[PDB]
Design goal:
- The PDB classes it as viral protein.
- The entry lists the keywords Rotavirus, STA, viral protein.
- The entry is titled "in situ Subtomogram average of Immature Rotavirus TLP spike".
- The structure is cut from a larger assembly and holds 4 copies of chain A and 1 copy of chain B.
- By secondary structure, chain A is an alpha+beta fold.
- Helices cover 26% and strands 30% of the residues of chain A.
- In chain A, the strands form 3 sheets. In chain A, strands 3, 4, 5, 6, 7, 10, 11, 12, 13 and 14 form a 10-stranded mixed sheet that branches. In chain A, strands 1-2 form a two-stranded antiparallel sheet. Chain A has a two-stranded antiparallel sheet with strand order 8-9.
- By secondary structure, chain B is mainly alpha-helical.
- Chain B is 73% helix and 0% strand.
- The chains are: A alpha+beta, B mainly alpha.
- At the B-C interface, helix 4 of B face strand 12 of C.
């Protein structure tokens, strides 16, 4: 692994640092890096590719030492070098690819494709520059059994879930009361709905309590909370509890009350916020419980009194709505993130060549069905492939 | 808007400030959406 | 202040560069820098803690140096290194916790923790390794009395407020005309509503001009202007200005025509756009003025002409809506953003060890309360906290 | 162009690193390269301005040689350095701005300002630092014709185009069957709507088919798909085709059934998604097709029959929508975004000095008018001005 | 790639220059390059054939160097060269073809033959006599990032589509109004027709529009414009749109008035021409609009008044039209003219060697489908094939 990112960084600095006219002093360490590497490469022969329909490639390391140059090197060396550089980037691209599609229920935090295992031999230890990007550093830290870190702009952690619970339900469905929630992407939209507007609940107050569990634990998150749900506030026709008929829903939305947001971890109240809207901060949690109250209007105006008679026939139903968007977060484990395309690069290199997907990943790299069945083993596999994909990004856009 | 996004020369400008027909008409003939939108604003603001 | 970033960037260089496998000429000058730092530290003593639950810690300096004879790195090297690095990261983090929870009524340009107080002393200035980070560069060139910049994505700069203006109000609240707005995060949703639908107004036209002042100077605003008002397009039971009554609102949207926007700077026309949608740019402004007309369709269709009769009663009320979203900007004062965590980190570290609410920050790091009543003194103190939060973010995760 | 990025990074490194106190070898190389820049640039006139109202300045270079004989840094050295770098940054930004508002129709990547035209002479190609950042990296690369790439978050690819089409029409507009959509920024929201709910069509399912064609082949994009018309969910009063009649559309929402999204390229089908929701990844596409079915419920409980009378007079209409957001990607051409600041600077610097519009660029750099007619010459001119904007973007933010 | 053009021209110069009797000084360059070639080409083997019907052929190089100390040439020397010339020209031909057949979905500007793939190495870069033909030059220019240029005589840029359009239709065709137009080869012929001769219409004027977009912009076009439709001037029987019956056409020609031809660029007027025929010029255009008004004549001799009876039954039909012809042009891409055998030769050889259809070239080289969806990858492969075919052309006959 370490070999991979070391060589990728040295090839990147090669592609980006050899331009005509620089002092010979800004490049001396670089050319000596390259020379050490190639000296190690003189003698190595490699065979790779061939799982799926991937091509079989044979690589032969036969080039001599780079050219020693004057004060300011000239374009001849540039061309001679970048030729072998093209060949080297081809090699490493096919390397990342051959590594990208392999999976195993057992170990596999470590390399699995035998080519990298050859790279795992002590003979390739001399070839190593450093690590500068995050993921390799968290790799080495997990190699040290310590804490890790990953900063996501809108992390994607929620499992696709459009589902509702029933409290007051009739086989005819015109006296409903309950709570309907949409979990999706990096968003949660909950809505507590009632048809009688709490005429029979004491104090003209109806309680709602809802709880979302996540599969992995986040850290130090920033979360925006807006007090009107923006997905459930319009009329709808909704399927049945048995999946065999349909009912109607005409909404009216009010400001909620007793909006109480708790960030929990194993039965301990880690954070609690009362009626605070806008962006909030949470120090450490893995589950979120929302509690709120739908209050019958203490007084009402003539237009309103047509909204909640004390009778049974109803043509508008009340609802409070709450939307929650995790703007940015930090996680210790590896999660597919918004800004980077690491998930995207992985799935693209998985699909583009019709590779029959592994025995533990989902069919076709479906991500939400994956996190629904997200395991520690799957966590680690995704971690390694994300590592190698971030490597791939380094040399081929 | 005009000077910003259309770079009229100083001559065309000093014509405009006079409300000079030459420049207004030639600009409409070049169809700057801004000028036609202003004249349409004027037309519509006529509500007999 | 610079001294601390120098220390921590060097500590980052240690964490990143001295890992078995490097040629010594690649770290040589780094090694000299690190030994110079450690020398400069031998000869002083520090004390920390002393407010909130933050404990006092007494820090000494009597250390050993790292070898400079190595040609290729061995493990015992980085072992003895991490030995000292543990102490140094503990020290820098303790310094951060200490200073983050301090204040000054004015002149917040200076730290108030004994640590930095003695730490900016002359005998310490030898360690100015570099100013690689962005915020430290801003801080430096600020010391030199110069113009700066910071590039933020979807910052939270608008003052949060959920309120509404009526221009024609009747107590019974069955014939009303006015303007509604919502300003939060980087969103402004603004709408104008008419019950007469401008069937009695001169020229079959209604005008709304809405003025949103920005509290801090912006530069290079990329905005999206879109013809909807999403949160303002569904029935509502709103409290009136009575503080004792409640009124009804059922909207329908017409096309907002002659939509004109003016981005002003201290009161001079700067950017002025007219009947243009999608993406838009403003260069340098401090307030926004939105002028727009509402117009009754002179032509109709039966289903239309029923809802908008020639009489005074009214059941549907016309409304025009505009959406303004500021995607990314460059600012000249420190701001809370949608892509970093400084605000979050500082709020966390304040709440953690029971910091009694001091005499400067508004209570509870309520960002909206802070921004709505912005002050130069407070922006100074927040600049301090954000630079040092960035400092902290480098080492500890 | 490379000489401009050279000078830019020269000045940026001089602004951040060299301050009094550090170790000399830590800056010595940088000082040597800076001094060579000086030695070679002194003794040549540079004439900026000479079009429009932008000021016409002259530039002369005779700055001395900053000392390399020191080992530790004195206040006077950095004093001179700042006094000189002020001059230099003013020069670089003025020449940048001048190159900004120039264009051509032939050789759209060629130098256009007299300063740069003089400067790209080979006797200034002996001072070039590196190519470190992204935009000049891609410029140099596409000059050598390897594969290209720019990383975009929220790539505003489509124009704004609020259009709709009718499949079954009426002169009274009371039996509409068709589609509406709003496509702009990064977002697409397309909805298919019906009035008779397939009470005449075979099998009680109504088909809708919709296309969106792109103008550049994107690459490796994550896309979120959500099952709703998030901007077509409220009663509407809309013009007909010739704008002589206004029709009334009052929606009710169902689920979209047999949702079939197809990413097509080059007259071939590339990738599919059927009944998958939430987030997805697509490798390589230039056209999106959305084929979706609207189904009638088989059973209806008391609430529904009023929503759907089996006879021809209808009040409430059924509709199903799709929301499609391309989260992030990498483009092989240049585009704007919501997370960078290139477009804003381009537009501002063009707006200020009242530059007479050129024969090639569209007025006001109107982005949507550009995208509707993306032509290769304009593209290469974009790329040029965006590299120049990045250059400016490191020097005076 | 370059090496193949070099070799072809080299052998061409051999064929045209190396003839008995001359001064060896006259051929110095030629024999110098030839000996360089044989220096490079010994010690290696090349393979072709296998794909399609091309038989696998192996090729070697063992010929010895050629004399230089002569004074005047003898046919002995000539055939001494010619026996090698034959082998080499045949090998050139075969490599040309084995490249010609090849096509792939990705990266098509590069070659696809392992022959050319081996040719790309440094060992072959010694070989170059000259690059002075037009197509290799445009090649090297689209390599050097300069404005490319392809001159053409009578280009076949308009795709083939002969269809008509109606504005008013009777199921029996006793009252019509519409247009016909055929755009073939390099010319277009449009003709708008009415049966009423616009008697009922307002102010005795009937408008006609017709637009044509091109899939590749042109430059410095010299267009010819003749007002007529010789192709639509004789009584026709034409098939309806649905396909069950036909309709009649007996038109009578008038001359069109206020004929406006508008050559627009990206929705910007560049050339506009009214009240004028003959040869006109367009500097930079890609979108043609022909708008013309038919005016019912002012006053008519009785034989004419018989033609257009003001009553409803029509016994003759009115028509006015235009014809637009492209003689010479200049473009950014590759095109099909009426004076080059590139398109001819490539189609012919693909047929003769009977290559199956591949996913880039549509079946049967039908230039219609070729130019219908002209797009990047197709363009690149077409440039490649035209280039290599031109390489072939000078020698094959």
């Amino acid at each position: 692994m370490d070999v991979l990112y070391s060589l990728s960084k040295t090839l990147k600095d090669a592609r980006d640092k050899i331009v005509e006219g620089t002092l010979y002093s800004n490049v001396s360490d670089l050319i000596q890096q390259f020379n050490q590497m190639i000296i190690t490469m003189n003698g190595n022969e490699f065979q790779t590719g061939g799982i799926g329909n991937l091509p079989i490639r044979n690589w032969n390391f036969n080039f001599g030492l780079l050219g020693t140059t004057l004060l300011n090197l000239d374009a001849n060396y540039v061309e001679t070098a970048r030729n072998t550089i093209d060949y080297f980037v081809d090699f490493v691209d096919n390397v990342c690819m051959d590594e990208m599609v392999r999976e195993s229920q057992r170990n596999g935090i470590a390399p699995q494709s035998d080519s990298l295992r050859k790279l795992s031999a002590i003979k390739f230890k001399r070839i190593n520059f450093d690590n500068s990007s995050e993921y390799i550093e968290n790799w080495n830290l997990q190699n040290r059994r310590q804490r890790t870190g990953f900063t996501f702009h809108k992390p994607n952690i929620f499992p696709y879930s459009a589902s509702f619970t029933l409290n007051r339900s009739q086989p005819a469905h015109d006296n409903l009361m309950g709570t309907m929630w949409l979990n999706a992407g990096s968003e949660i939209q909950v809505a507590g709905f009632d048809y009688s507007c709490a005429i029979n609940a004491p104090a003209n107050i109806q309680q709602f309590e809802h709880i979302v569990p996540l599969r992995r634990v986040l850290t130090t998150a920033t979360i925006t909370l807006l007090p009107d749900a923006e997905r459930f506030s319009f009329p709808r026709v909704i399927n049945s509890a048995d999946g065999a008929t349909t009912w109607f829903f005409n909404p009216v939305i009010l400001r909620p009350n007793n909006v109480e947001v708790e960030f929990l971890l194993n039965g301990q109240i880690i954070n609690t916020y009362q009626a605070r809207f806008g962006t909030i901060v949470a120090r450490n949690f893995d589950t979120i419980r929302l509690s709120f109250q739908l209050m019958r209007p203490p007084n009402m105006t003539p237009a309103v009194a047509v909204l909640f008679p004390n009778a049974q026939p109803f043509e508008h139903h009340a609802t409070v709505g709450l939307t929650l968007r995790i703007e940015s977060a930090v996680c210790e484990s590896v999660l597919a993130d918004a800004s980077e395309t690491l998930l995207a690069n992985v799935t693209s290199v998985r699909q583009e060549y019709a590779i029959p997907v592994g025995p533990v990943f989902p069919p076709g790299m479906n991500w939400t069905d994956l996190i629904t069945n997200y395991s520690p083993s799957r966590e680690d596999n995704l971690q390694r492939v994300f590592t190698v994909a971030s490597i791939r990004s380094m040399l081929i856009k | 808007n005009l000077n910003d996004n259309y770079g009229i020369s100083r001559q065309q400008a000093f014509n405009l400030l006079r409300s000079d027909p030459r420049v207004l008409r030639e600009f409409i003939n070049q169809d700057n959406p801004i000028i036609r939108n202003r004249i349409e604003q004027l037309i519509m603001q006529c509500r007999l």
